Write a protein that binds this DNA or RNA. Structure first.
Lengths: 207, 82, 71, 99, 81, 215, 129, 22, 121
RNA sequence: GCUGCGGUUAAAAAGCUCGUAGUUGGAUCUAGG
RNA sequence: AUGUCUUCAUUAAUCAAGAACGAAAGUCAGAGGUUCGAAGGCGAUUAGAUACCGCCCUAGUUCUGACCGUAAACGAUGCCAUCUCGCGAUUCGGAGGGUGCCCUGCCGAGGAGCAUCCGGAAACGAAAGUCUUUCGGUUCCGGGGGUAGUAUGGUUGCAAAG
RNA sequence: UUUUUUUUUU
């Protein structure tokens, strides 16, 4: 996306998706995500996944203070990715149970004031989505074919239900945000302080 | 979705839409010239024919009426007339 | 629903009149036997002759003997 | 106050449904309303299967089974505890309980 | 609103949804204002201080149409092909 | 006063100076000191104090519900309800609730658009349970033709001339006041031709004075 | 049985506007419907619309601009005299600053402001605001 | 079975009234 | 009965979190430690706290305990997190014979892609 | 209660259908330049 | 219902008066009379027990030909037309494929259910929504609770009663 | 198995 050839879907990037099965959606289709479906499992269109990801990345970058971006997930497969994403992007991460009253109860010591909320799944983190609507906080989420888009601002179609694809999708979002920040660049790659940040730094590892 | 082109519907949807509820009604039936092995006389026939259309000369049954489209006798093919 | 046509004036008027009789106030004011049923015959006051003095037990939860008179 | 959306029956697209006589009380209850229970049991209680087998006159005999379809009216079902009252929310659950 | 002999005597002019053109009331807390940063096609780095503002009303967000609403606004503005 | 929210911090630091920017950005208000700072002409009134009783094993537990209406007579009104075990605390909490619920009220003209607005921009109806209140624009000098309860709210909102039509169990003070409040606040949500012009979205206070927030 | 194509069309428009859709399809189109929509467009309450021909009553597709509060028909078409026009507008329209009462007069279908300019009465068709 | 019995009572009363009127 | 109240449980948790080094698996050692590390107004209370601390130590040895944060265990967890293999499992080098279904009809063609490794099953 | 009421549970949809009076009835004929 | 490039061309919707059908019980006549069973009679229970429980049963329950025209005759929601949401199941017919079954996010017509805008006093309702932003057409009905569906008059019926 | 009642006002 971006109306540019320097930000287009690259060959190895698209390669990674079929490696991680990040294009195999569920067998149920939500009528609001009939756009990102190319024709058993409903395989999603890769190009749409790319364009939405860049769109989400630009939105996250608009929050000048990275702390105000809060990433929330309760999926066990996302606990690894969520920690890394916050570490590299300087965001704030919520793991497991999302304490209700996080964004509405000003007395709570857990009280937070996000400017942008990123969700691993609308259904799993329904409480965060609901809490956001009480404070006018836009929400970005990774959405599968059957997921509900209610109160979802930007939905990045992908395979969040997958074990490996979920981690990869978080990895690109951190990359795209960093690429569009000056920390890294497309040619240099996902490197900070001389360390290769590798996709399986995010993948879920069984204890 | 809120923004849907009601003026130019997708052709596949127009095909998989009821004949009356399309933007402009169009029947799903057609006229077909039927060729039967043997007399080799082309005969025009309505797809949803409810009468037993009979060969003019050879007096062989060409279609059998049914609940929907007429069933062609075995050995007889058809081609859609424009 | 009620009729709404441009030429339903008769139905509307007749229905209104028919249903006005199901109104207690209208029926009480137009029944026709008002004068023969009301003891005062439609007046505000009336003169009478006392026949006896009676006591009426007050309704609950009150208790007293109200001093009434038969006229 | 209307307690149930189906009004306690399973009658849709229908005017009249024939009744059945309850198993215990004998009361007439519409077939869609009656609590039905299909029971398949061993012809002999579990504690005597070994005795019957050891007394069997045949080397290998398959013990038959009793099949009974039971119909209960609401009263005789509640009393027998075949079915129980539920909370307002749990009333709408339609899945059979674990067995 | 213009009134009087040409003056504006309104307390404030409310925002309107970028997609449905519906007024966003003072107590509409389900409405959002997303900002997308501007980029240079070649370098790929954000232009400091430049962004695109989209406002979506609570009703549209609640119907779940905010996804395609934002996508269509972005396509119109060229952020997406 | 030590603000606990970003909005409160900005208001205390005088980076947000009018209630109109908060209303424009639809930012929720969670501290009454924000309203105290940004509107210095508010006056409050206790419309009613009604006791409510909850049955228990040892008789009835009685608490008092207080309804309070606050407003500046210049297009800002708010309604608050608080139930507590004592009348004093109920009144204090209701004042706080009304302050937090302060809302803007659009005023318009009935006929000639000369002078300052005096009445409601258009026929606006609000509803609560069964009480529905409809406010109809009126010409100048007419005053407020309404019941004593909606009259107080209209006076506080600053409406000068207005006809009313109230239907339902108006003897329910709380619902009557809430219906009036809803009708008053519908004014800045009714889309009239004079708001058709497409404006440009600006920075939110969080977007603009964020250097202080981060610092 | 259908008896007011204008009522059906205006109801469809209202429902689509509430749902926030961008286009609306109107079935049995008619001259009265076209004139009503033309008045609404001239006053800026709708966008452009197309009259789809199908060798029958036809259809219309209207572009909604998200600016119409309500478009309603008045049935039966009561006769409105120029003297009671004021009462009717005060009763039906939300304010004197906006909203229009559509009448059909001998001159043609127009709004109440034009009818009062030309000193015409007629039968009321509907109103929008 | 509280108003139905009042209906029965009134039906018996009406039967008696018919018989007496005859 | 033998259920420990929240007073004892909270005190034990704070003590374990603040003096993990001094807490062994011996009741007498834990008691002696508590005597000097905390001001407890009752000998029975101190003994209850020491006993629950020992019982918590026994579980800490087996594995991580919720509510308790132990330095060495969090070092171990962060090491397992930081584990990054020598080369990607998604590196084009390993991506050789991806068995893809007919989905490549145009999903991988109209996007402008001619991936060599994809093999249509 | 025409403007302007209500009829699942508060009073109130006839058991259901046919049917005369009454009431109400699809689109369509000179638009443009 | 579906299919239909068949035919007619406004012939339609709702309907005072008027008319057909209308559970069960009930009435008349003739047959049948197993089972069950109002009334009735006994045995229990009880302070009593004209009841619940048990036993024996009459009308009835069944068939044919006539009457009655009422039910919580209920979805306690009149009929016709139209608009507004998602999902996956189900009955019938059709279209397109694979091997009666499977698939087509297939097309209509039903009967529902759970994601439900708006509505509602609420319970709750995809209608009970699109209504103070009221107004598609039309029929019937209500106007605080009783007296009372009573009295009287009229009419229908053998009666009961409507 | 049996298990009926509880003056008026406050």
């Amino acid at each position: 996306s971006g109306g540019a050839a320097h930000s287009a879907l690259t060959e190895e990037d698209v390669m990674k998706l079929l490696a991680t099965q990040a294009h195999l959606g569920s067998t149920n289709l939500n009528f609001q995500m009939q756009q990102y479906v190319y024709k058993g499992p409903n395989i999603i269109n890769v190009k749409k996944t790319w364009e939405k990801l860049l769109l989400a990345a630009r939105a996250i970058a608009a929050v000048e203070n990275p702390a105000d971006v809060v990433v929330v997930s309760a999926r066990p497969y996302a606990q690894r990715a969520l920690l890394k994403f916050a570490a590299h992007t300087g965001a704030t991460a919520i793991f497991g149970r999302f304490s209700p009253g996080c964004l509405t109860n000003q007395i709570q010591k857990t009280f937070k004031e996000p400017r942008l909320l990123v969700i691993s799944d609308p259904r799993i983190d329904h409480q965060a989505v609901t809490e956001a609507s009480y404070v006018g906080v836009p929400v970005i989420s990774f959405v599968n074919t059957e997921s509900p888009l209610k109160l979802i601002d930007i939905g990045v179609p992908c395979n969040n239900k997958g074990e490996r694809s979920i981690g990869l999708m978080w990895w690109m979002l951190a990359r795209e945000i960093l690429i569009l920040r000056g920390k890294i660049s497309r040619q240099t790659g996902f490197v900070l302080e001389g360390k290769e940040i590798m996709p399986d730094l995010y993948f879920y590892r069984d204890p | 979705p809120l923004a849907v082109d009601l003026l130019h519907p997708e052709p596949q949807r127009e095909i998989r839409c009821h004949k009356l509820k399309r933007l402009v009604q169009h029947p799903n039936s057609y006229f077909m010239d039927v060729k039967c092995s043997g007399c080799f006389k082309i005969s025009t026939v309505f797809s949803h024919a409810t009468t037993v259309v009979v060969c003019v000369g050879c007096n062989t049954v060409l279609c059998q009426p049914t609940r929907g489209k007429a069933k062609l006798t075995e050995g007889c093919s058809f081609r859609k007339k424009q | 629903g009620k009729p709404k046509g441009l030429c339903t004036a008769r139905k509307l008027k007749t229905h209104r009149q028919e249903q006005r009789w199901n109104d207690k106030r209208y029926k009480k004011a137009h029944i026709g036997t008002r004068w023969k049923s009301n003891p005062f015959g439609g007046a505000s006051h009336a003169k009478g002759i006392v026949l006896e003095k009676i006591g009426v037990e007050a309704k609950q939860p009150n208790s007293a003997i109200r001093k009434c008179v038969r006229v | 106050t209307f307690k149930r959306r189906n009004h306690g029956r399973n009658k849709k697209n229908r005017g009249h449904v024939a009744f059945i006589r309850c198993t215990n009380c004998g009361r007439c209850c519409p077939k869609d309303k009656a609590i039905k229970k299909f029971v398949v049991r061993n012809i002999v209680e579990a504690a005597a299967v070994r005795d019957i087998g050891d007394a069997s006159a045949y080397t290998q005999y398959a013990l038959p089974k009793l099949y009974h379809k039971l119909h209960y009216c609401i009263a005789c079902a509640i009393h027998s505890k075949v079915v129980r009252n539920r909370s307002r929310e749990a009333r709408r659950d339609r899945n059979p309980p674990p067995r | 609103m213009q009134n009087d002999a040409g003056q504006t005597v309104e307390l404030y002019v409310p925002r309107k949804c970028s997609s449905s053109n519906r007024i966003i009331g003072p107590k509409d807390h389900a409405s959002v204002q997303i900002d997308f940063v501007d980029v240079d096609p070649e370098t790929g780095r954000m232009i400091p201080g430049k962004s695109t503002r989209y406002a979506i009303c609570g009703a549209i967000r609640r119907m779940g149409e905010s996804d395609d609403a934002i996508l269509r606004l972005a396509q119109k503005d060229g952020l997406v092909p | 006063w030590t603000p606990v929210t970003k909005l409160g911090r900005l208001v205390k630091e005088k980076k947000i100076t009018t209630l109109e920017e908060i209303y424009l950005n639809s930012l929720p208000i969670k501290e009454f000191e924000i309203i105290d700072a940004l509107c210095s002409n508010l006056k409050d009134e206790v419309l009613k104090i009604s006791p409510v009783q909850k049955q228990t094993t040892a008789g009835q537990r009685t608490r008092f519900k207080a309804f309070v209406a606050i407003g500046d007579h210049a297009g800002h009104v708010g309604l608050g309800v608080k139930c507590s075990k004592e009348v004093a605390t109920a009144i204090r909490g209701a004042i706080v609730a009304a302050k937090l619920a302060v809302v803007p009220v659009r005023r318009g003209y009935w006929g000639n658009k000369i002078g300052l607005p005096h009445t409601v921009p258009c026929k606006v109806t609000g509803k609560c349970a069964s009480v529905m209140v409809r406010l109809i624009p009126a010409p100048r000098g007419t005053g407020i033709v309404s019941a004593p309860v909606p009259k107080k709210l209209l006076h506080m909102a600053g409406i000068e001339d207005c006809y009313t039509a109230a239907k339902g169990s108006t003897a329910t003070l709380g619902n009557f006041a809430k219906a009036t409040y809803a009708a008053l606040q519908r004014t800045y949500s009714y889309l009239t031709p004079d708001l058709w012009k497409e404006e440009a979205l600006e920075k939110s206070p969080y977007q603009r004075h964020h250097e202080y927030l981060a610092r | 049985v259908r008896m007011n194509v204008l009522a059906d069309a205006l109801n469809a428009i209202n429902n689509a506007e509430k749902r926030g859709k961008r286009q609306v399809l109107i079935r049995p189109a008619s001259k009265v419907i076209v004139r009503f929509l033309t008045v609404m467009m001239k006053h800026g309450y709708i966008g452009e619309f197309e009259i789809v021909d199908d060798h029958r009553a036809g259809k219309i597709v209207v572009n909604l601009t998200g600016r119409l509060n309500k478009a309603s028909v008045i049935s039966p078409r009561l006769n409105i005299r120029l003297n009671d026009l004021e009462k009717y507008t005060n009763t039906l329209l939300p304010s004197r600053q906006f909203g229009y009462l559509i009448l059909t007069t001998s001159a043609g279908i127009m709004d109440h402001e034009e009818a009062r300019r030309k000193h015409l009465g007629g039968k009321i068709l509907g109103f929008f605001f | 079975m509280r108003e139905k019995w009042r209906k029965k009572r009134m039906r018996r009363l009406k039967r008696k009234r018919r018989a007496a009127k005859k | 009965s033998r259920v420990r109240t929240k007073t004892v449980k909270k005190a034990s948790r704070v003590l374990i979190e603040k003096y993990y080094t001094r807490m062994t698996n011996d009741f007498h050692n834990n008691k002696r430690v508590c005597d000097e590390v905390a001001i407890i107004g009752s000998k029975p209370l101190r003994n209850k706290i020491a006993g629950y601390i020992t019982h918590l130590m026994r579980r800490i040895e087996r594995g991580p305990v919720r509510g308790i944060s132990i330095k060495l265990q969090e070092e171990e967890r962060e090491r397992r997190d930081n584990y990054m293999p020598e080369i990607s499992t998604v590196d084009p080098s390993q991506l050789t014979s991806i068995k893809v279904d007919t989905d490549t009809s145009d999903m991988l063609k109209a996007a402008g892609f001619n991936l060599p490794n994809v093999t249509v099953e």
